Amino acid sequence: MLTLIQGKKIVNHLRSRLAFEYNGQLIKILSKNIVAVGSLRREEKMLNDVDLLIIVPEKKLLKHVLPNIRIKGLSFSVKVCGERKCVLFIEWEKKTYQLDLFTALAEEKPYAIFFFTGPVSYLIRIRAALKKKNYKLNQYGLFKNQTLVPLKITTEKELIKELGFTYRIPKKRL
DNA sequence: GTGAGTACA
DNA sequence: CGTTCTATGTGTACTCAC
DNA sequence: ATAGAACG
Ligand SMILES: Nc1nc2c(ncn2[C@H]2C[C@H](O)[C@@H](COP(=O)(O)OP(=O)(O)OP(=O)(O)O)O2)c(=O)[nH]1
Ligand SMILES: [Mn+2]
Ligand SMILES: [Mn+2]
Structure with a gap:
């Protein structure tokens, strides 16, 4: 578990550092297109996981836009991924924390x-x-x-x- | 290579 | 009859026959 | 939200 202060810090760092690899050269996920949701958007005091909603601008990138995902300069291990839901664990500080991600056009x-x-x-x-x-x-x-x-x-x-x-x-x- | 049962939201 | 308690949903990604 | 059922 992690707090809303922790979460807010984590989500803010990631929004420099997200992008996917579309057949070689990796195309940068623009942060005006990512939206904090679940507990963090409800601003609950205590967080179980950070849940994020990526908005894709054409349908035919869903084949690529979550199973080829990268977060710059930070470790993570994947437990599941798909076109529209992708769950990851992170290494933040000494911490291990869980990161859900979700897509919609x-x-x-x-x-x-x-x-x-x-x-x-x-x-x-x-x-x-x-x-x-x-x-x-x-x-x-x-x-x-x-x-x-x-x-x-x-x-x-x-x-x-x-x-x-x-x-x-x-x-x-x- | 279509289709029920589960895991986790 | 008023207060109060309770029930309520549905998609994604996976697994495991066939 | 909403309606039904259990309880004074
Ligand atoms: N827990 C849960 N969330 C669901 C369910 N169906 C849709 N959701 C949505 C609402 C949640 O806010 C969102 C992600 O929820 P999470 O499982 O990550 O937890 P949430 O963000 O509510 O707070 P948390 O992570 O528990 O601190 O998914 C469900 O059946 N269970
Ligand atoms: Mn959450
Ligand atoms: Mn979640």
Whole structure:
């Protein structure tokens, strides 16, 4: 375990140091395209792991953008990886800590953040509401009866509100 | 080289 | 009848027949 | 959020 002060330090260092190797020359992951989520974005006092959400700008880099990932100048061991979820352990200070990573394309941004900030209890509650209205909300979208439901939205609030729910900051999300 | 059961969110 | 407790979801990456 | 069930 590690604190929000530790986490904040760790996430800030990484945002200089991320990139993936796309067939030789490695293309630099721009930090305006990475977003701290889960506990750290809710600003909980104590952290179990740092969970991060990378936004890809074309679909056909998902084949590359997590299983060929590098963090400059620091050690790590991989336990799992895929196109959209990739879990890593880090060596920080003398510390070993765990780092989840997650991807969505820009079309998906707020829903990935809303899904990934948690908390777990909030996600469990919030969904039942719309299953009662026979809708489905996921990392990627909002859908009904097998067809996506498009909305005129850009940020997470406009999503939560377009869904018809109290918007609140991630500290006390429940 | 399609398809159920599990692990971990 | 009011207060309170409780239940509630679903995708990714993996494994292991076939 | 939301509704049903257990309890005064
Ligand atoms: N724990 C958990 N998280 C889930 C689940 N489903 C979706 N999530 C989302 C919400 C979480 O905020 C996000 C990552 O959660 P984590 O497992 O890393 O923990 P979280 O960030 O909530 O805080 P933590 O790492 O426990 O200190 O994934 C689930 O079933 N369990
Ligand atoms: Mn976390
Ligand atoms: Mn996590």
